[PDB]
Amino acid sequence: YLSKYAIDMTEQARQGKLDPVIGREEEIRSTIRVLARRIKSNPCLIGEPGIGKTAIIEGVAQRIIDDDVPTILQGAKLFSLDLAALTAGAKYKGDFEERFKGVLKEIEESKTLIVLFIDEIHMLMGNGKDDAANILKPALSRGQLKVIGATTNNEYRSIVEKDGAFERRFQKIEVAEPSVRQTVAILRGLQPKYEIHHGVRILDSALVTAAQLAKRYLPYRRLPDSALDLVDISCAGVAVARDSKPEELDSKERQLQLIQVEIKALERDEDADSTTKDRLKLARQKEASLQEELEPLRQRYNEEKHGHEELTQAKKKLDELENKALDAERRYDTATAADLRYFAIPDIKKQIEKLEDQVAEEERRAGANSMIQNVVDSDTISETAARLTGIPVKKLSESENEKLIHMERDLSSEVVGQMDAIKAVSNAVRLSRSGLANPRQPASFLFLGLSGSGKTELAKKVAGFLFNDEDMMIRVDCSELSEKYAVSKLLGTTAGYVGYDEGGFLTNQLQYKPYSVLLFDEVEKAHPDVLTVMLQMLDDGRITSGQGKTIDCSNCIVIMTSNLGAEFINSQQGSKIQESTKNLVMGAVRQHFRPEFLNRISSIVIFNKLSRKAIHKIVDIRLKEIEERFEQNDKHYKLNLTQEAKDFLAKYGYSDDMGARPLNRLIQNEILNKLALRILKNEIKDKETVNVVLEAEECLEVLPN
Amino acid sequence: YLSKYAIDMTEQARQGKLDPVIGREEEIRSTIRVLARRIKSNPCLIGEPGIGKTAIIEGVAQRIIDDDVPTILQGAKLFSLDLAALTAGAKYKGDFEERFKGVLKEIEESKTLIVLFIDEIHMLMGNGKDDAANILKPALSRGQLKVIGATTNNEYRSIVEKDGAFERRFQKIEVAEPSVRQTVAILRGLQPKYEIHHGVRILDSALVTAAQLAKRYLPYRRLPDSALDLVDISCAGVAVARDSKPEELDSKERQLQLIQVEIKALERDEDADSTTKDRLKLARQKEASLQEELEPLRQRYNEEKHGHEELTQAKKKLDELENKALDAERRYDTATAADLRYFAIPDIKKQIEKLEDQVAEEERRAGANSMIQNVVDSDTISETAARLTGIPVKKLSESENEKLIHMERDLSSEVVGQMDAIKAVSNAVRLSRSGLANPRQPASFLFLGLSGSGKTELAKKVAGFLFNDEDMMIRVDCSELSEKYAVSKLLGTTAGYVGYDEGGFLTNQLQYKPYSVLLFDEVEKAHPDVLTVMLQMLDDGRITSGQGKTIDCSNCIVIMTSNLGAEFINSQQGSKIQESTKNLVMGAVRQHFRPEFLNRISSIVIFNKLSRKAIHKIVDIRLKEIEERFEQNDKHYKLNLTQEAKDFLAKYGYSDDMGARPLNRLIQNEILNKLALRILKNEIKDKETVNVVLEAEECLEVLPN
Ligand SMILES: Nc1ncnc2c1ncn2[C@@H]1O[C@H](COP(=O)(O)OP(=O)(O)O)[C@@H](O)[C@H]1O
Ligand SMILES: Nc1ncnc2c1ncn2[C@@H]1O[C@H](COP(=O)(O)OP(=O)(O)O)[C@@H](O)[C@H]1O
Ligand SMILES: Nc1ncnc2c1ncn2[C@@H]1O[C@H](COP(=O)(O)OP(=O)(O)O)[C@@H](O)[C@H]1O
Ligand SMILES: Nc1ncnc2c1ncn2[C@@H]1O[C@H](COP(=O)(O)OP(=O)(O)O)[C@@H](O)[C@H]1O
């Protein structure tokens, strides 16, 4: 029977068993217009699967119930036919086929216009036709059977390369991820569902931050989903908080126990006549005192709890009344709609407001009540995210804009000098955003000046501030870009060719890190073909993967690096790269890259010869970096390098061969080895001081012990 | 019929029998949070076999027991439904299905929210899915039918990838292995259960050491359970060792009984009256003397045992009274709580205090009388470990610091030559072990140098030293790691391809050895991709399979050997390698590997030519080794190596083309073979100790008689 597994979605939705659908109307209308088409009556939802898409289909079911359809579809009924219909519904080979033909024939059989839909449209045609109604359904569609399908970009793209008839039969509609703003409106629409689900209110701001954070920190998941995860999760987290009632009750009740236990113990003994044991009477006074606290505590918890329960039920009833009104209105049973629309629905609205007054959010806190409700925009959602993303509130709390005026400073704290570079970079980061640059034109730079200048480290630190994650960066070995430029290429292995490794670095990492910075290590050595795909990446960087052939590029900040101007930089005797010298570098830039590439870069930036005066500061930054993390602070050298270690390190550090790079071999192989030893030998146990105990570099720093 | 189909975990918790665990409170709150979630309502505990998933859920049930569960779930009941419930009832296809549906109907209607727990998600779906719940279950989710699942990280990924359905209703909860510290706390929590079962009290420090030992020596076993395995096993060890009541007694009772029988046999005999047999009277004095010691041992053990059992029961009873009293207080039934708190509880608590005082404890032991059977923290655990892992004495003598302190010395006593290297390596290891180094990256170094000169032998000795086991090393033939790198790459084959020994050579061995030494033989010849893969999982040692399973052995010391510097080694510029020849080598290193590789290695060693000075001595050392290897006391040669053997061997030994390598052959070819001949003659009973007496290499040793 069709009744097995096929779900009458219009009946389901009619019964109020369908969530309201918000902000999809254009896609829904498109779907309906397709169903209306006399020939190509079969729409298909395409795009990114985390977006769900199904709500659109369900939106159609709702339109059918309410008949907000073209009337040629007035008699339509919409059914969900999927998975279990062919899988759980089958025991032996061939049952699969019968579930199709059996049901589908019943679908044709007389009972008005039936539209079916399959959310995994890909289940049909299997992985290579096998008549998983691959032919049958089309045959049946000749016989009216209108079908709504849903798929993914990966799926139909493979389908049309194996078939193509599907495409000829289907009107693909891509489902767009809603903007955060749209998402919030959506969340508001769904807000009472979640409030009901958990017995909590949700701060409107929380709806906002859920969308913002879902988007900002969990972008790998499509926003409608991710946002709702923050909502239902955070709401549940609050529901868990709503069961913290016992923490106060048990504190007092456990104290009653200790007292009740002592009272009998105290009641009879050799010393019963002494004030030592007669304290029993005081124990009873304390047992009573705790009861005095427990009475208003328990009463408060229950009064407030009831206010939340009543609020919740009022919201449930408002929604049930509206569901019924909507049914009655299309039925033209407006008298019964009136029973809901007049007085009842608005009265419940007013009951809800009064019940929120019982919840009593007050100037004292987010709910005067002890239930703890009101998902908090900041702390609740943020911590929810912390549970999902990790990293502390700083990550989760920013004005954003402010980074331009703080991050450039903090960056100068992380790396020494290069302030002009820092400003240039910082500027593109916040200004490309606030400047509303084409969103597919993320900040991008070419980092010139030489290795050892920290230009790379800057970018790393920038990732730090941009994403609260230095390891957000995607590094690309551009020197490993020979004529083969295959898997390692931004595109990776071409679809259908051997090797499923695609987008060597780019897909492979952006798919996990959509918000990221990418860095091209010695980009100057890249094969021109790569430089060409990079050109694309630098502007409208819509890079298509090797196998999937999908694109996901936006906030993909790009830093390219080179030692391209080295002779010019070597010539420079000062710090700030001199005029003309910089032009010599530009000459070389133009030799290596075409203007069409270069013009896409937010800025070409040449890093300065920071020299001694800078490394003199770098050594403190590095030194404290090491100790600041350490393990646990049960040590703490004064970190008093003094000019001895600072300068010996600088001399042993800032080599023109690699600038400051040796610094991180220094320390390690000069003192850290000793720290470990002296500490593990139990010579050194806490604190300590830094100084130098005086062949090349033979003093080797050597700290006090 | 549910009781046929599943175990009421919650009721069992009411009945106890579910040992409580700690350290999973967040997992539990999360489980609950998910269960509270109304959309993705079903949690899964994902981790490792033995990760904690079972107890976590039983802990969840405990939250139900004590009303620490939100109103949504508060009245819920938890059942364990698995294996027997899934397949034992199968006689034909159909039991599972009807049994399954039966359950779902019973847990859904009327009888609150009965929640199911699937202990093994593996059993769901299974090999081919077969609607083993997985299809109808979520289809039926409209009935809530709340369920908790659990599996491993690896299996989890494969089921999600195959599914895309339960995924949409479930919330993954990752379960971390508890730290050693956490584990110990847990061990303490369960210690009584062991002490109770076994009749073996255990010194607290045992638990401390057990967790340490478990992590350290029971490679693939997880702490919350494997530590217990050491406990359970060692408890049993003691339980067995004590045999007849405590240790000491058993052995003396065995003497007593052997004596008792002898005496009685002597008492009635042909010559019983002769001093030949009448000596039984003195044997009787021994029987009696033993009896006089044995009785106190028995009595101390037994009376204390009685107290031990009384403590066992008293503590159980204490918990029962509090559990019931809590039920009473959460219901506000102060009368019942009082009945279970006044007298009830003072009685049990005082029994416990009195009993513990009667048992009493000493600094030497957690039981002043006998019910400890002299169990000793590390000694008895270590011996347990020795039985499980071997190397008794060095496992006993395992101080981290005795090693770290003398590390380079001890290593130099085994390895002779570039002691500087030994120091360098030692230091790197110290940094790693000390946590001074970034804890994600174990020490590792490039290892160049003259062949046949102990480069890998050092690694063996390091492994020896660090693990008390030369077998701890894993070796990699890097030259075979051409572009082909597949089953042979660390990750192994990409899952989905034929063959699942995915880096078995690498990853699985690494799995078996989570603390280890790994050496790359001719790392310079590895394909750049391989080097990259290694590098990426070299620092931040996230060893990961083709299925995405990470071993993460941040504890592996890695050696990256090659012949890269051979052209400079061949310069023969001294024994200790002349400075600047080393620079040329390092130049070559810098050119043979991308600097990024070199940016992560912790160090580099280029082994010195030993010259005649050292090899003349080294050979003597291996001759010692040969004897050390020998199985019995009929050798123990000094071997008259005088100078002549050292010279013979040196002359025909230390070649630039193979170094000391062929010395085992010289020794074998001439020494062992000549010994074999004489041994064969069997005219040798001990010592041997012979010298060199004589075309090519004419001395040929040739040993005397
Ligand atoms: N504006 C919205 N209003 C209601 N639901 C929405 C809205 N936007 C997205 N959704 C739905 O939330 C659900 C998340 O996807 P879901 O349907 O659960 O997964 P899938 O369709 O892949 O099985 C989808 O139906 C999605 O369409
Ligand atoms: N605080 C700092 N300011 C500027 N540079 C720094 C700072 N700390 C470290 N560095 C240097 O930045 C460099 C990062 O490497 P990089 O310059 O890109 O060299 P390479 O291109 O050889 O990898 C290192 O030389 C590192 O020491
Ligand atoms: N002390 C403990 N801490 C946490 N879990 C424990 C402890 N003792 C036993 N267990 C549980 O037993 C399980 C291992 O045994 P078992 O219950 O059969 O489950 P598993 O399938 O994981 O092996 C662990 O998952 C763990 O939950
Ligand atoms: N001082 C030494 N200590 C230990 N082994 C040494 C020493 N000198 C030479 N050798 C020998 O080098 C041989 C193996 O040399 P090694 O360089 O590690 O191997 P390979 O050349 O096979 O890579 C061993 O027989 C080892 O004893």
UniProtKB/Swiss-Prot annotation, chains A, B:
Effect of residue 480 to K: Abolishes the ability to refold aggregated protein in vitro and to provide thermotolerance in vivo
Cross-link (Glycyl lysine isopeptide (Lys-Gly) (interchain with G-Cter in ubiquitin)): 277, 455
Consequence of substituting residue 617 to A: In NLS17KA; fails to concentrate in the nucleus
PTM-bearing positions, type Phosphoserine: 41, 141, 370
One MF annotation (Gene Ontology) recorded for this entry: unfolded protein binding
Mutagenesis / variant outcome for changing residue 539 to N: Impairs prion propagation, but does not affect thermotolerance
Substitution effect: residue 150 to T: Reduces ATP hydrolysis by 98%
UniProt name for this protein: Heat shock protein 104
Native source species: Saccharomyces cerevisiae (strain ATCC 204508 / S288c)
Coverage span on the entire protein: 166 to 882 of 908
